[PDB]
Amino acid sequence: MTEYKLVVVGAGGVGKSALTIQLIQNHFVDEYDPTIEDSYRKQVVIDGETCLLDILDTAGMRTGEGFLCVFAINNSKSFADINLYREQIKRVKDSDDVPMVLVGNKCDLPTRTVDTKQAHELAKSYGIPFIETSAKTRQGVEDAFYTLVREIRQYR
Numbered sequence: 212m213t214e215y216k217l218v219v220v221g222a223g224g225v226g227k228s229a230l231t232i233q234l235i236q237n238h239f240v241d242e243y244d245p246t247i248e249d250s251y252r253k254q255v256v257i258d259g260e261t262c263l264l265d266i267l268d269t270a271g272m273r274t275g276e277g278f279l280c281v282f283a284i285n286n287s288k289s290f291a292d293i294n295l296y297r298e299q300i301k302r303v304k305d306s307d308d309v310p311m312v313l314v315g316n317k318c319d320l321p322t323r324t325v326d327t328k329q330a331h332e333l334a335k336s337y338g339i340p341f342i343e344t345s346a347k348t349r350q351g352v353e354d355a356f357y358t359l360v361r362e363i364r365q366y367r
């Protein structure tokens with residue numbers, strides 16, 4: 212079956228692990244050791260297609276085929292840091308055309324300090340999709356990962 216190597220990047224505490232575990236294990240982690248970096252695998256169906264996802268949950272690469280660049284909507288600094296991660300990815304892949312998706316996580320929270328204009332304008336600056344997620348409620352989580360897969364499909 213088709214295989215896709217995904218990588219989740221972003222500042223500490225944004226929800227990289229929570230997003231990954233919601234996808235892989237279907238549950239929300241209220242805490243997850245910020246030092247655990249691992250790959251997590253799952254056979255899934257995306258748009259009817261059976262495939263294998265291999266997801267690298269990073270902690271603060273070269274074989275990654277698509278990247279989620281994650282910030283938290285209640286963490287301005289995490290948004291500022293997105294550019295460092297995007298550039299890291301461009302360098303590690305030696306390419307400007309790497310599939311990626313901008314993810315604004317923790318959208319369940321009312322304490323928003325990165326607005327929807329900021330996020331949408333950044334995504335337009337990168338020419339990539341922006342997806343609002345909550346690892347807590349599961350809103351957007353499949354959409355974020357699967358959109359990335361569809362970006363890899365396009366790229367292939």
Ligand SMILES: Nc1nc2c(ncn2[C@@H]2O[C@H](COP(=O)(O)OP(=O)(O)O)[C@@H](O)[C@H]2O)c(=O)[nH]1
Nearest residue numbers: 223224225226227228229240241317345346347
């Ligand atoms: N309210 C809320 N909290 C979240 C969400 N995603 C992650 N968290 C919490 O934010 C903290 C850091 O998440 P974690 O996945 O460890 O972030 P990482 O350092 O990027 O892996 C944890 O306490 C999570 O339970 C979310 O969508 N909403």
Ligand SMILES: [Mg+2]
Nearest residue numbers: 227228244245
């Ligand atoms: Mg983590």
Ligand SMILES: [Mg+2]
Nearest residue numbers: 248249250251
């Ligand atoms: Mg491992």
Ligand SMILES: [Mg+2]
Nearest residue numbers: 256259260261
């Ligand atoms: Mg099918």
Ligand SMILES: [Mg+2]
Nearest residue numbers: 287324325326
């Ligand atoms: Mg502001």
